[PDB]
XYZ file of C-alpha atoms in Angstrom:
668
model
C -77.478 -301.152 66.926
C -74.277 -302.669 68.163
C -73.756 -301.541 71.734
C -76.183 -304.616 73.438
C -73.963 -306.204 76.219
C -71.041 -303.987 76.014
C -71.469 -302.690 80.031
C -68.487 -301.513 82.331
C -67.947 -303.142 85.773
C -65.775 -302.202 88.965
C -64.788 -304.528 91.372
C -63.548 -304.249 95.165
C -61.798 -305.748 98.081
C -63.129 -306.561 101.449
C -62.094 -302.924 102.397
C -64.411 -301.929 99.554
C -61.321 -300.650 97.872
C -61.732 -300.196 93.971
C -59.440 -303.190 93.119
C -60.112 -303.876 89.673
C -62.016 -302.321 86.393
C -63.368 -303.957 83.419
C -64.719 -302.238 79.971
C -66.140 -304.424 77.402
C -65.045 -303.584 73.792
C -66.082 -304.306 70.447
C -65.483 -303.148 66.836
C -68.219 -303.039 64.231
C -65.652 -304.417 62.016
C -65.505 -307.629 64.436
C -69.204 -308.050 65.381
C -68.907 -311.493 66.613
C -66.061 -310.858 68.874
C -66.226 -308.965 72.192
C -63.132 -308.011 74.062
C -62.614 -307.498 77.963
C -60.430 -304.953 79.047
C -59.257 -304.886 82.499
C -56.752 -303.032 84.664
C -55.848 -303.346 88.282
C -55.351 -301.575 91.480
C -52.982 -303.341 94.163
C -53.769 -301.345 97.627
C -51.188 -301.075 100.590
C -51.362 -302.092 104.191
C -52.318 -298.348 104.805
C -55.610 -298.950 102.223
C -54.133 -296.528 99.604
C -52.838 -297.416 95.950
C -49.830 -299.957 96.018
C -49.994 -300.338 92.196
C -51.677 -299.666 89.038
C -50.494 -300.310 85.677
C -51.009 -300.150 81.765
C -53.245 -303.245 80.736
C -50.817 -304.376 77.506
C -47.486 -304.122 79.712
C -49.461 -305.779 82.615
C -50.458 -308.682 80.438
C -47.101 -308.963 79.051
C -45.963 -309.339 82.560
C -43.862 -306.163 82.859
C -44.117 -303.659 85.764
C -43.762 -299.775 84.779
C -45.579 -297.607 87.459
C -44.946 -296.525 90.863
C -46.607 -294.475 93.876
C -45.094 -293.570 97.112
C -46.243 -291.672 100.218
C -46.037 -290.265 103.697
C -47.505 -292.167 106.596
C -50.797 -291.306 105.251
C -51.562 -287.977 102.914
C -50.085 -288.133 99.656
C -47.373 -289.052 97.053
C -43.898 -288.299 97.754
C -42.483 -289.954 95.176
C -43.966 -291.454 91.886
C -42.598 -292.940 88.511
C -43.816 -294.269 85.145
C -42.151 -295.400 81.841
C -43.937 -292.667 80.459
C -44.140 -289.553 83.028
C -40.361 -290.212 84.805
C -40.169 -289.817 88.282
C -41.584 -287.036 90.397
C -40.733 -285.836 94.024
C -42.216 -283.041 96.216
C -42.413 -281.949 99.866
C -44.609 -279.377 101.792
C -45.188 -277.951 105.070
C -47.413 -278.769 107.869
C -49.397 -275.992 106.307
C -49.132 -277.177 102.936
C -46.720 -274.718 101.638
C -43.987 -276.365 99.509
C -40.434 -276.722 100.343
C -39.238 -278.461 97.066
C -40.368 -279.967 93.838
C -38.484 -281.809 91.087
C -39.244 -283.015 87.484
C -37.750 -284.474 84.058
C -36.032 -287.332 86.163
C -35.447 -290.295 84.051
C -36.015 -294.090 84.287
C -30.118 -298.396 87.007
C -29.782 -298.113 90.654
C -31.618 -294.661 90.986
C -33.262 -292.130 88.557
C -31.290 -289.333 86.814
C -31.450 -286.216 89.255
C -29.006 -283.906 86.730
C -32.137 -282.760 85.128
C -34.415 -282.156 88.114
C -34.676 -278.634 87.408
C -35.616 -278.391 91.236
C -37.933 -275.620 92.496
C -37.574 -274.128 96.213
C -39.514 -271.394 97.697
C -38.791 -268.252 100.093
C -41.404 -266.771 102.229
C -43.105 -264.287 104.664
C -41.727 -264.354 107.987
C -43.020 -263.220 111.637
C -44.986 -260.889 111.504
C -46.221 -261.313 108.186
C -48.686 -264.308 107.401
C -46.175 -266.498 105.885
C -46.566 -266.441 101.889
C -43.723 -266.870 99.765
C -41.633 -263.740 98.978
C -39.823 -265.721 96.431
C -38.924 -269.126 94.767
C -35.890 -270.174 92.734
C -35.075 -272.960 90.188
C -32.194 -274.190 92.191
C -30.622 -275.792 89.235
C -28.701 -279.186 90.355
C -25.027 -278.604 90.818
C -25.334 -275.820 88.178
C -26.415 -272.087 87.606
C -29.225 -271.565 90.514
C -31.414 -268.629 89.581
C -34.361 -266.918 91.381
C -37.289 -267.364 88.962
C -39.817 -265.024 90.840
C -40.478 -262.651 93.577
C -43.195 -261.366 95.581
C -43.911 -258.134 97.256
C -46.922 -257.628 99.666
C -48.270 -254.713 100.673
C -48.598 -252.710 103.991
C -51.692 -250.928 105.143
C -51.020 -247.303 104.479
C -53.826 -244.996 103.591
C -52.446 -244.888 100.227
C -52.794 -248.951 99.841
C -56.121 -248.929 101.558
C -57.612 -246.327 98.947
C -55.884 -248.458 96.292
C -57.665 -251.651 97.983
C -53.932 -252.695 98.008
C -54.030 -253.489 101.600
C -51.780 -256.771 101.998
C -52.038 -257.312 98.018
C -49.148 -259.057 96.051
C -48.578 -255.510 94.992
C -45.573 -256.843 92.774
C -45.132 -260.019 91.523
C -41.857 -260.241 89.581
C -41.822 -263.492 87.621
C -40.442 -264.982 84.561
C -40.651 -262.620 81.417
C -40.800 -259.822 84.112
C -43.197 -258.244 86.647
C -46.869 -257.322 87.504
C -47.092 -254.547 89.581
C -50.494 -255.022 91.160
C -50.974 -251.172 91.213
C -54.444 -250.549 92.045
C -57.570 -252.236 93.425
C -61.204 -251.381 93.690
C -63.481 -252.148 96.855
C -65.291 -254.711 94.722
C -62.146 -256.601 94.666
C -61.752 -256.317 90.758
C -58.575 -254.381 89.765
C -58.475 -250.506 89.311
C -55.262 -251.180 87.486
C -52.112 -253.516 86.767
C -48.957 -252.636 85.209
C -46.870 -255.049 83.264
C -43.243 -254.948 82.982
C -41.755 -257.127 80.397
C -38.101 -257.439 80.017
C -35.333 -254.968 79.384
C -35.138 -256.491 76.019
C -37.968 -259.206 75.617
C -35.872 -259.881 72.756
C -32.903 -260.812 74.317
C -33.500 -264.630 75.269
C -30.573 -264.464 77.510
C -31.847 -261.801 79.895
C -33.174 -264.535 81.905
C -36.311 -262.994 84.055
C -34.442 -264.436 86.918
C -34.386 -262.112 89.607
C -30.506 -261.951 90.482
C -29.432 -258.856 92.113
C -31.383 -257.756 95.438
C -33.628 -255.029 94.158
C -34.724 -253.272 90.989
C -31.806 -250.948 91.271
C -30.291 -254.022 89.490
C -33.493 -255.442 87.797
C -34.007 -252.363 86.049
C -31.369 -253.887 83.875
C -33.923 -256.682 83.148
C -37.355 -254.555 82.842
C -38.464 -253.035 79.611
C -39.178 -249.215 78.654
C -41.845 -250.464 76.694
C -44.223 -250.991 80.064
C -47.824 -251.181 79.702
C -50.873 -250.779 82.094
C -54.765 -251.916 82.291
C -57.065 -249.830 84.204
C -60.472 -250.872 85.026
C -63.970 -250.048 86.941
C -66.436 -252.980 87.410
C -70.012 -253.702 88.620
C -70.753 -254.225 92.444
C -71.491 -257.486 90.830
C -67.811 -257.238 89.807
C -68.733 -257.679 86.002
C -66.761 -255.080 84.034
C -68.250 -251.037 83.931
C -65.252 -249.968 81.770
C -61.501 -250.561 80.853
C -58.336 -248.887 79.494
C -55.658 -250.734 77.875
C -52.334 -248.544 77.806
C -51.224 -248.991 74.091
C -54.374 -246.994 73.161
C -57.488 -249.317 73.560
C -60.225 -249.246 75.766
C -63.555 -251.098 76.991
C -67.581 -250.696 77.743
C -70.394 -253.209 77.870
C -73.743 -253.669 78.699
C -76.235 -256.363 79.604
C -79.481 -257.957 80.116
C -81.264 -257.998 83.589
C -79.844 -261.533 84.293
C -76.370 -260.217 83.299
C -76.104 -261.487 79.796
C -74.610 -259.528 77.393
C -76.672 -257.031 75.253
C -74.302 -254.868 73.871
C -70.337 -253.597 73.834
C -68.113 -251.072 72.442
C -64.331 -250.845 72.363
C -62.106 -248.079 71.724
C -59.480 -248.989 68.910
C -55.886 -247.981 69.742
C -55.734 -244.172 69.911
C -59.262 -243.685 68.117
C -62.882 -244.321 68.346
C -64.887 -246.616 70.409
C -67.626 -248.082 68.463
C -70.575 -250.925 68.638
C -69.845 -254.550 68.002
C -73.295 -256.168 68.600
C -76.308 -255.593 66.321
C -78.623 -258.425 67.830
C -78.111 -260.969 70.704
C -80.633 -263.176 72.091
C -81.039 -266.319 74.432
C -83.012 -269.474 74.873
C -84.724 -270.211 78.121
C -81.627 -272.608 78.241
C -79.771 -269.135 78.630
C -77.444 -270.388 75.424
C -77.697 -268.287 72.431
C -80.916 -268.016 70.311
C -81.279 -265.094 67.788
C -78.194 -262.919 67.070
C -76.985 -260.378 64.278
C -73.541 -259.594 63.513
C -71.887 -256.009 63.369
C -72.104 -256.552 59.384
C -75.540 -257.410 59.773
C -75.560 -261.305 59.043
C -78.561 -263.126 60.894
C -78.063 -266.262 62.970
C -80.568 -268.601 65.215
C -79.930 -271.642 67.219
C -82.068 -275.037 67.453
C -82.416 -277.347 70.295
C -84.291 -280.547 71.207
C -86.527 -279.144 73.886
C -86.613 -282.363 75.446
C -82.853 -282.539 76.033
C -81.230 -279.243 75.071
C -79.056 -281.002 72.769
C -78.286 -278.578 69.942
C -79.917 -280.180 66.900
C -78.563 -277.439 64.635
C -77.857 -273.549 63.647
C -78.856 -271.482 60.826
C -77.450 -268.130 59.343
C -78.602 -266.055 56.404
C -77.844 -262.612 54.835
C -80.782 -259.971 55.076
C -82.592 -258.295 52.024
C -80.547 -256.107 49.924
C -77.415 -256.633 51.891
C -73.633 -255.853 51.142
C -73.252 -259.122 50.017
C -76.524 -260.052 49.078
C -79.685 -262.050 50.496
C -78.276 -265.698 51.016
C -78.663 -268.675 53.744
C -75.001 -268.900 54.935
C -75.599 -272.081 56.717
C -78.030 -274.429 57.917
C -76.210 -276.801 60.007
C -77.956 -280.132 61.161
C -76.470 -283.006 63.221
C -77.273 -286.592 63.746
C -77.054 -288.664 67.102
C -77.149 -291.939 68.804
C -79.125 -292.206 72.014
C -75.919 -291.396 74.031
C -75.485 -288.395 71.654
C -72.382 -289.543 69.417
C -72.694 -287.766 66.272
C -73.614 -290.297 63.541
C -73.733 -287.787 60.491
C -73.783 -284.091 59.777
C -75.214 -282.322 56.909
C -75.268 -278.656 55.583
C -76.620 -276.331 52.838
C -75.509 -272.698 51.787
C -74.012 -282.301 51.681
C -73.331 -284.911 53.777
C -70.835 -286.752 56.526
C -71.076 -289.702 58.401
C -69.183 -291.740 61.119
C -68.825 -295.288 63.013
C -67.710 -296.181 66.385
C -66.374 -299.014 68.385
C -68.555 -300.032 71.302
C -66.029 -298.320 73.409
C -66.478 -295.158 71.289
C -63.495 -295.044 69.306
C -64.330 -293.365 66.235
C -63.159 -296.067 64.026
C -64.322 -294.433 60.455
C -65.373 -291.284 58.755
C -66.620 -290.499 55.551
C -67.610 -287.381 53.370
C -66.083 -284.730 51.236
C -62.942 -283.687 51.134
C -60.787 -281.395 48.376
C -58.977 -283.176 45.429
C -55.027 -282.979 44.951
C -54.084 -281.681 48.284
C -52.418 -285.016 48.398
C -51.289 -286.978 51.254
C -51.211 -285.041 54.612
C -47.570 -284.317 55.812
C -45.954 -281.641 57.888
C -47.385 -278.922 55.668
C -50.430 -276.909 54.820
C -51.437 -277.121 50.989
C -52.420 -274.278 48.841
C -55.874 -273.263 49.096
C -58.241 -272.978 45.780
C -58.189 -269.476 44.313
C -60.836 -268.111 43.365
C -63.316 -269.461 45.760
C -64.777 -272.521 44.171
C -67.618 -271.683 42.032
C -68.332 -275.590 41.260
C -68.481 -278.530 43.792
C -66.461 -281.297 41.983
C -62.930 -279.939 43.352
C -64.292 -282.049 46.421
C -64.682 -285.883 46.653
C -65.568 -288.946 48.552
C -63.222 -290.212 51.279
C -63.063 -292.998 53.776
C -60.774 -292.387 56.664
C -60.173 -295.182 59.445
C -58.378 -295.648 62.691
C -56.977 -298.383 64.761
C -56.285 -298.552 68.611
C -54.744 -300.786 71.340
C -56.328 -302.260 74.271
C -54.034 -300.447 76.280
C -54.159 -296.466 75.569
C -52.291 -296.642 72.360
C -52.812 -296.365 68.662
C -51.562 -298.550 65.713
C -52.351 -297.077 62.489
C -54.428 -294.514 60.471
C -55.792 -295.485 57.110
C -57.310 -293.457 54.369
C -58.481 -293.305 50.920
C -59.991 -290.400 48.707
C -60.416 -292.949 46.116
C -61.390 -290.793 42.855
C -58.302 -288.537 43.769
C -56.205 -291.998 44.260
C -54.918 -290.483 47.535
C -54.293 -293.547 49.893
C -52.404 -294.042 52.877
C -51.869 -296.281 56.118
C -49.546 -294.564 58.240
C -47.814 -295.943 61.528
C -47.109 -294.351 64.698
C -44.328 -296.315 66.090
C -44.882 -296.816 70.036
C -42.725 -298.128 72.661
C -42.445 -301.765 73.561
C -42.674 -300.674 77.208
C -44.241 -296.838 77.136
C -46.425 -294.464 75.525
C -43.389 -292.806 73.884
C -44.274 -292.926 70.142
C -43.601 -291.405 66.828
C -44.348 -291.383 63.064
C -42.768 -294.086 61.313
C -40.436 -291.672 59.322
C -38.513 -290.943 62.433
C -38.323 -294.476 63.271
C -40.553 -297.875 62.669
C -38.923 -299.945 65.650
C -40.948 -299.645 68.865
C -37.950 -300.465 70.835
C -35.784 -297.894 69.334
C -38.640 -295.117 69.309
C -38.384 -294.878 73.299
C -34.534 -293.353 72.965
C -36.445 -290.202 71.266
C -37.629 -288.716 74.409
C -36.518 -286.989 77.485
C -36.449 -287.980 80.959
C -39.815 -286.172 81.391
C -40.744 -287.916 78.204
C -41.066 -285.071 75.985
C -40.179 -285.571 72.631
C -36.744 -285.086 71.104
C -37.834 -284.097 67.419
C -40.638 -282.565 65.111
C -39.248 -284.201 62.114
C -35.743 -285.978 60.935
C -33.828 -283.306 62.392
C -36.121 -280.782 63.905
C -34.870 -280.519 67.386
C -37.001 -279.556 70.170
C -35.582 -277.140 72.517
C -36.969 -278.044 75.968
C -35.878 -276.018 79.129
C -36.186 -275.762 82.470
C -39.883 -275.816 83.837
C -40.506 -278.208 80.928
C -40.660 -275.257 78.610
C -40.032 -275.685 74.903
C -38.217 -272.412 74.310
C -37.982 -273.446 70.253
C -37.724 -275.710 67.427
C -34.569 -275.516 65.525
C -36.599 -275.475 62.332
C -34.512 -275.718 59.049
C -32.339 -273.206 57.644
C -29.800 -273.403 54.938
C -26.358 -273.474 56.632
C -28.467 -273.681 59.672
C -28.625 -270.041 59.214
C -30.160 -268.348 62.303
C -31.739 -265.647 60.241
C -34.692 -267.929 59.692
C -34.939 -267.867 63.638
C -37.652 -269.258 65.733
C -38.175 -268.906 69.680
C -40.970 -268.340 72.260
C -40.954 -266.266 75.548
C -42.873 -267.708 78.346
C -44.220 -266.061 81.321
C -44.232 -267.025 85.125
C -47.636 -268.763 84.372
C -46.248 -270.042 80.851
C -48.134 -267.356 78.816
C -46.692 -267.426 75.264
C -46.029 -263.543 75.589
C -43.758 -263.160 72.903
C -43.193 -264.797 69.306
C -39.400 -264.149 68.423
C -38.837 -265.773 64.793
C -37.067 -264.372 61.819
C -36.905 -264.797 57.965
C -33.829 -263.737 55.667
C -33.448 -266.454 53.257
C -33.364 -264.503 49.820
C -35.560 -261.904 51.523
C -35.332 -259.046 53.665
C -33.953 -259.833 57.331
C -37.375 -259.027 58.944
C -37.741 -260.339 62.616
C -41.112 -261.883 63.167
C -41.615 -260.287 66.345
C -44.760 -260.253 68.147
C -46.321 -259.707 71.325
C -49.274 -261.027 73.259
C -50.818 -259.361 76.287
C -54.405 -259.070 77.453
C -56.735 -257.759 74.400
C -53.567 -257.146 72.199
C -51.118 -258.571 69.761
C -48.565 -256.517 68.244
C -46.842 -257.935 65.274
C -43.678 -256.501 63.133
C -41.876 -257.677 60.252
C -38.766 -255.788 60.896
C -34.933 -255.541 60.758
C -37.263 -252.658 53.152
C -40.369 -250.815 54.635
C -41.218 -252.946 57.654
C -44.589 -254.357 58.445
C -46.078 -253.228 61.622
C -49.496 -253.850 62.907
C -51.795 -254.417 65.828
C -54.805 -256.774 66.390
C -57.178 -256.498 69.559
C -59.265 -259.141 70.977
C -62.933 -258.134 70.060
C -64.895 -260.082 72.852
C -64.024 -263.030 75.028
C -66.909 -267.318 68.067
C -64.971 -264.430 69.017
C -64.524 -261.544 66.728
C -61.003 -260.413 65.184
C -59.886 -257.049 63.857
C -56.585 -255.418 62.322
C -54.988 -252.100 61.678
C -51.462 -251.880 60.037
C -49.241 -249.158 61.175
C -47.177 -249.937 58.032
C -47.017 -252.410 55.230
C -49.795 -251.578 53.391
C -51.521 -254.467 51.540
C -52.854 -254.409 47.858
C -56.564 -254.111 47.416
C -57.172 -254.622 51.081
C -58.441 -251.771 53.712
C -56.684 -250.862 56.913
C -58.850 -251.127 60.019
C -60.429 -254.307 58.891
C -62.834 -256.339 61.124
C -64.400 -259.936 60.619
C -66.719 -262.271 62.196
C -66.410 -266.123 61.914
C -68.554 -269.466 62.297
C -67.437 -272.935 63.438
C -68.307 -276.172 64.186
C -68.959 -276.738 67.999
C -65.436 -277.686 68.476
C -64.694 -274.134 67.213
C -63.307 -275.794 64.386
C -63.346 -272.689 62.396
C -65.034 -273.384 58.969
C -65.914 -269.762 58.072
C -64.915 -266.229 58.268
C -66.780 -263.191 57.060
C -66.021 -259.580 56.860
C -67.774 -256.169 57.406
C -69.704 -256.316 54.054
C -70.731 -259.883 54.601
C -68.658 -261.450 52.136
C -67.096 -264.545 53.317
C -63.297 -264.268 53.254
C -62.777 -268.352 52.563
C -64.320 -271.661 53.518
C -61.847 -274.223 55.395
C -62.397 -277.503 56.900
C -60.366 -280.258 58.756
C -60.343 -284.073 59.223
C -61.231 -285.273 62.630
C -57.512 -285.824 63.066
C -56.992 -282.152 62.071
C -55.531 -282.248 58.621
C -57.471 -279.606 56.272
C -60.309 -281.385 54.218
C -60.806 -278.265 52.291
C -59.044 -274.929 51.728
C -59.562 -272.152 49.474
C -59.109 -268.214 49.204
C -60.183 -264.965 47.671
C -56.848 -263.082 48.232
C -53.753 -265.137 48.054
C -51.837 -264.495 51.484
C -54.684 -265.526 53.609
C -52.599 -268.228 54.615
C -51.304 -265.895 57.196
C -54.570 -264.064 57.762
C -55.985 -266.554 59.974
C -55.061 -269.270 62.363
C -57.631 -270.044 64.586
C -58.891 -272.981 62.741
C -59.030 -276.699 63.691
C -60.884 -276.845 67.004
C -60.659 -273.371 67.234
C -56.888 -273.859 68.260
C -54.160 -271.590 67.041
C -51.980 -272.702 63.878
C -48.442 -271.977 64.104
C -47.807 -271.232 60.425
C -45.108 -274.128 60.365
C -48.355 -276.145 60.699
C -48.769 -277.137 64.178
C -51.353 -276.020 66.084
C -50.932 -274.518 69.807
C -53.741 -275.347 71.844
C -53.159 -273.602 74.952
C -50.848 -274.931 77.248
C -49.476 -277.387 74.681
C -48.668 -278.161 70.786
C -50.095 -280.492 68.696
C -49.191 -282.895 65.635
C -52.122 -283.200 63.581
C -50.602 -285.557 60.695
C -49.695 -287.569 63.642
C -53.096 -287.093 65.173
C -51.308 -286.687 68.731
C -49.773 -284.371 71.100
C -46.297 -283.373 70.142
C -45.954 -282.798 73.881
C -46.939 -284.569 77.230
C -49.402 -283.429 79.666
C -47.785 -285.044 83.166
C -50.211 -282.954 85.392
C -51.957 -285.842 86.736
C -52.917 -289.622 86.297
C -56.674 -289.221 87.259
C -57.075 -287.090 83.762
C -55.865 -289.962 81.757
C -53.161 -292.761 81.400
C -51.612 -291.496 78.219
C -49.835 -288.217 78.320
C -49.983 -288.023 74.413
C -53.458 -288.902 73.796
C -55.861 -286.585 72.483
C -59.695 -287.035 73.272
C -60.569 -290.263 74.404
C -60.645 -291.384 70.677
C -62.646 -288.979 69.467
C -61.316 -285.318 68.816
C -64.981 -284.254 68.026
C -66.126 -285.363 71.448
C -66.637 -281.911 73.182
C -67.149 -278.154 73.069
C -64.130 -277.921 75.501
C -61.648 -275.144 74.870
C -58.974 -276.000 77.352
C -55.985 -277.062 75.399
C -53.756 -278.839 78.044
């Protein structure tokens, strides 16, 4: 038990201010050596943060961070070699007048990319809410990103409970008409207008022109709506989803879910749950899926730590009686996972005293080779025999400041071995796969002023756009042909409302067009008999359904329904159908490369994308997490979180050196 004498300590000035802090570190590879890691917080004449720094740049005697404020209050201006700079101002009332971003590290930082946001308001008598805000592009095409309409107090509005409501919010990707409300405060309805053609990347959803006499040129015919009724407690009583779906739900006395039903598009509504039951801790205890497979849950009653979860098929079931899993987990006193096992057999881990997970070992499938920018083939059919997977060691290395060095692996019986470097800046968190460059001075040129990265791969440029928005990646195409298109639409709250890719290389010119709305995705491979389908969100460990409109598959039914099983990260190792037949097994390294993959039907590569950490695969092999996108072979964000330093010093860092750490689904 290595951990003896690895405390942490915080230190203060005579004003009691948090001048310094210390963490002791010790690799189990280095059991005789204890590192002391420290950083500083200088404070000003105001009694507020003057300076705080990266440990390693600091002890290399370089200064790389800044924070500047009003007379008291809050930061006006703030820079890092990582973040770039940032400036804001707000009212006496805290209403915002201006914000700017993506400003470089020279006399002054580069304002030409400032991507300025500024705001327009309700005025007397109205309470003073913004009626609009605009992207005031510096020296360039300034454009009104959004517009708010606030209701009056007509009897109509009162009945709709829209009195004073933001009855419109025009926005990037279009408008929500906040178009009726219940007296509980929950909506009676909302209408969404997407753009006149949401396909058209250059109809900007910027509200030039004075009113929708103009803006009709920018809003769709394909307008959709949700309608809702609720508990006095506000929980949903029923709902309607204008493409043809609809909702009903029922609950236990504490408000826990008993049962639910959803209308499929233009058709029947049917029961989801067969059994659902919970612990005294309120957490789940005993369940049975709509296919009829049975689950139960197991906890340490002293602590409510989940020690395991078990699932089986009942007698005479369509897929036959079988234990499907019996997950068991091993923990240290703090609760870090030491090992796991399952039967339907084992894996194990090592940590630094600082709880960097330095090593992992277990089974991974042979022949997939060294993980790159790729997803290798499933084993097909589902392996009847186990030797196709084999022992591995996987290991990792890190800085005393918040940076990694290398990743290091063997699956020795496969002869698959590597050690692979993230080159990281001599003076920042900016860093890339060795393939892009091996040089830590040169690497810092590969990034924007915000510190967003230039490329996915040797030429795979990242189309960062105003409001820090990665509209597309170039991918690769022969002759650079746009027929293999890619792009995404983002709404005013960055919702990935549309996929707009395409393919035509040696194939039908199908646009991969897909739409993303509450409870809904619609996909078409169009522009051959076009593929056309919808999928609908079955709850919230969620459940998933399909219906083709067109493009019938071989040997597969339409209207198909599936449940799934995951590890606690929602790493979605398992999927199962309405007959209780498993679709396939899958698994991931902690770094998120797939450890095992198989299929019972070949094109399963498209059928499931909620996978590693329950995050969403892009078919290229990236994972979309929520706000942001991830490079699994690099084990790192392909993106920056600049939203707050108190959340962490490194914008690209994942999960405090253990991606397995938490249940947390957030993904920003």
